[PDB]
Symmetry: D2
Subunit: 321 residues, 4 copies
């Protein structure tokens, strides 16, 4: 059952831009994201912390918000111009989705924004205006040995990947890689607007749930340093999977778990997908190299755990099996 294709154009989406995460103990979460991982504080107060990666100039890539139930409040995408916020609102209203528009934004440093409960149950935000901050690209005096340099993508778990895929294609995302069986059925898909492998990916499973949010480092040694530092801090039990090389995406990856169990991917090595006819790489569902190029052992929790997502009232979306 495909989502209908609207008669109005999709909003012109530039890239994933930030995620709003609800955490149960802000101070313990700050230790993880700032003291362990080195993300940069744009600004913070007692209940909210705004973080950005090294090469970011928009206000933030992560908003950590204290709350009663750990969950993801919003997956935010930046659109190309103010008119595209109006386009986003019109598109989701034609789809019959719940929408909420706030001229002054939902998170600090972001202006006119529309949030929607999308067709797959996810809270998506579209915005254009954002407060610019000092871009720390060349602030090597602040560079840590495990520096996270850029926000790259989201990964969502949903029960019907083919439905999800066609919905995101209509939204303008293109598939750089997918996993299919012999009958041509899509089991997972990596989808992009910007010129990397993906801005989001759809993973088959119980959902809506947030599988992970991902940041890139400049080189492989930076990822190894994150592992080494976690070992020295005696929190290696928070390293869930990796380091490894994924066949799909070609990423050298690491998955770690924050204090509430939210999964963060840190990776490096991506490749250019910007040409109009970029060739889709289709992996067979039985090729193990799709998961691990090197054959690394399977970690069960990577296939069972994922974060709840919220609706526009701040309540968890029930997870459908």
């Amino acid at each position: 059952n495909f989502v209908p294709t609207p008669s109005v154009p999709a909003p012109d989406i530039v890239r994933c831009a930030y995620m709003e995460i609800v955490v149960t103990d802000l101070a313990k979460s700050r230790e993880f994201y700032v003291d362990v991982l080195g993300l940069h504080v744009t600004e913070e107060d007692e209940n909210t912390i705004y973080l950005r990666s090294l090469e970011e100039f928009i206000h933030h890539n992560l908003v950590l918000r204290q709350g009663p139930i750990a969950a993801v409040a919003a997956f935010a995408y930046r659109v190309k111009s103010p008119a595209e916020v109006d386009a986003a609102e019109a598109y989701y209203k034609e789809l019959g989705c719940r929408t909420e528009r706030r001229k002054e934004g939902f998170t600090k440093g972001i202006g006119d924004s529309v949030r929607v409960e999308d067709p797959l149950g996810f809270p998506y935000e579209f915005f254009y205006e954002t407060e610019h901050v000092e871009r720390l690209t060349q602030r090597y005096d602040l560079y840590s040995a495990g520096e996270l340099v850029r926000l790259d993508h989201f990964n969502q778990v949903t029960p019907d990947v083919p439905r999800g895929r066609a919905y995101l294609e209509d939204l303008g995302f293109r598939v750089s890689e997918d996993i299919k069986d012999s009958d041509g059925v899509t089991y997972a898909a990596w989808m992009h607007r910007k010129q990397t492998v993906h801005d989001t990916a759809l993973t088959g499973g119980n959902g809506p749930r947030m599988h992970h949010v991902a940041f890139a480092t400049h080189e492989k040694h930076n990822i190894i340093q994150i592992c080494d530092k976690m070992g020295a801090l005696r929190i290696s039990d928070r390293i869930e999977r990796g380091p490894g090389r994924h066949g799909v995406s070609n990423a050298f990856y690491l998955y770690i778990l924050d204090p509430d169990g939210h999964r963060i991917e840190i990776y490096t090595q991506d490749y250019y997908t910007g040409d109009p006819d970029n060739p889709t790489i289709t992996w067979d569902v039985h090729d193990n190299q799709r998961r691990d190029w090197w054959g690394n052992p399977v970690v069960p929790s990577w296939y069972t755990e994922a974060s709840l997502v919220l609706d526009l009232d701040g309540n968890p979306q029930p997870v459908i099996v």
Copy 2:
């Protein structure tokens, strides 16, 4: 400044720089540099022409080496977004009064319908959409060399009037990610992009038209260091012109080397995302030395005096305006 007119018709929708056609005087000696020393991958070749691509490329080639009498650059080729944009490119340059030549079957093997033009700054530009796809070698780690060149990134052009050049490329849709200006606001150099990296081409002020360099990226810094180590072992370190260093403008960890005819190749790593619509332009002052070298590396005079000739559409060098 005599600015190039802004045409009444839309600029072609340019996706990225895509390849350069370089004329070399001794093809076998050039093949030893680009293939045996640098490891670029041969798409196909014959007695007079070699088609090369980088590791992560799927279009037919990123460099064409063509045997010829005078070392020079025959074409700077950009890939456009659809077949219709080749028609748009031809109409745009015809309105500007520039010489154009259209070939439905292409000018280089593996490329289809193309238009070449002698642009307003005297450079041979090509716009094409169609290209033969080849095996994308991204995950062919069995072919991966210690100094592997993974992607073609950009061109760098020398022209006498940078303000004229900048406004012409802005009209063509390129945006400025970084520039060098004086206190009065005059542009001395500019880095301009269509794809989401620092640049697809840059303008350097000087006698021109000339080609300053063509650049490839590696995955990491150690790959660049290995190119220098290998050139030292082969006793060709005198072909290392400048670097390794870190440029303040672009933030690139760079290396400039010279091919057998003196054509300059940049190998670099580290770039950053410029795809947002309001990406902030970084303006460097003309007197900030760190714009050239973040670490203060000594100036190499040839980098400011030598650059390659470019050809007109008849295959003859364009005169250098001094």
Copy 3:
């Protein structure tokens, strides 16, 4: 514990582990793994034997691959400080009542006067001083592979009685850089060195004598990652047994892979200096999981069950004591 007697004569002055002689069942298939996949350099070879060395080696070889009926290790060879120390080695092991064999012209090509012994733990040990020097390829960056193995570092042996083994190697002059003990002080494993790195050999408790692995170093971490990437591209990733990971004991960034006969090769990088006379021994508790994996990587069962047979001086396998 039945300790090996401490001889009345001095132990031979051992400089470092130097090479291992490995018997393989299909020499051509083994050559494809060690030379085509791993890039080790061929010193010389013939139809039945291949002599290999790492990039920075100047002695004749670090590995000898010998075709034979049963895959096993024929010798663990250590280089001693002078010709006189070969005489010292022979006298030491004869006093211990061990079988010895002395060959003035060596047991493997490129090695001179050597003594081999069936040591107190059942292992075939060789001590030699003289070796043919070959081109040290340290700066041959034109031959440098992306996953280059630069140096032979150590052996790792499985034996049933680690306390007996440790005291025997201490008497031979090896010092313990790190060990694993329980609250009672019993040694479960020990890393022992003569040269100034963490170890030349290590003792692992288990059925033995068996050879757990032989290890080579790379210059940097990315070189190890490239070995895994290349094995993935060649569709031989099932020969990657364990890693990459960081061991707490030794601090090594490691990778264990398996040759065609199942012999285990460690490739690692990062070691530290142990040459001071009072270098502090790091004792890890048997229940500290980080001793095995600093990052907590999952346990690979085969790493604790599989290890290679070793041969006696007649070329027959030494029985495994269980």
Copy 4:
């Protein structure tokens, strides 16, 4: 004119171990060594700072001492046992050199020591006893992106290299590499006791002067980070030479200058020299690759500037041309 070979044995030297440097403004020097370079403070007071590298367990690798004239007070070598301190004293006394023995040491954390004005005018110290401190090898929580992991060597400028070479050979050092002309005359030599390329090197020139003291990093990217951080701190004019690859030693190198002009080499990649017949690599004096494998331009100051050294009274040794 060779230094005579003593009838008593040379002290059994293990490795170079630390350098005592006099600086004119301790606070400005602390900013360089600790805040810029990340060396670890063992202990410090108002007039002296004791620093060590990441993998060191002896008390220190550098002692920074406030004083009126920037200079090097001592090049210290660790010997193999307490008896070797007696051996060192006997050896230099037979050579007619000035000696001073202090059972309680010259610098904190070092025990019984003998200092000597050696035959080439350098202040050398030999000691065995030292206070052990926490070895920070696995303290990845303290690891900086440009971490200096080990002290490797000293490099001295002296007018007569052949005299210097034979003197250090008699002392037990072996030559791993040298630079000679066609007649076989030694112009420079790299000499070692431990199993790396060198513990000291002799450079021909006006002396006695200290050319540089060197620390290793784990990998090349750590050296590039030091350069990047110095650029961000707008102190790139303190980067004197590099990064480059030396042909002699095969080191990937960087030379920087502290606040008083003292030269510090940071490098990586060395190779094993421990076998008894390790082959000496002799470079011709006209092979430019001996200096720079890549051909990097010559930096004049690297051949003209070097630090004064002190005598046992704390006064500068006059520099002989």
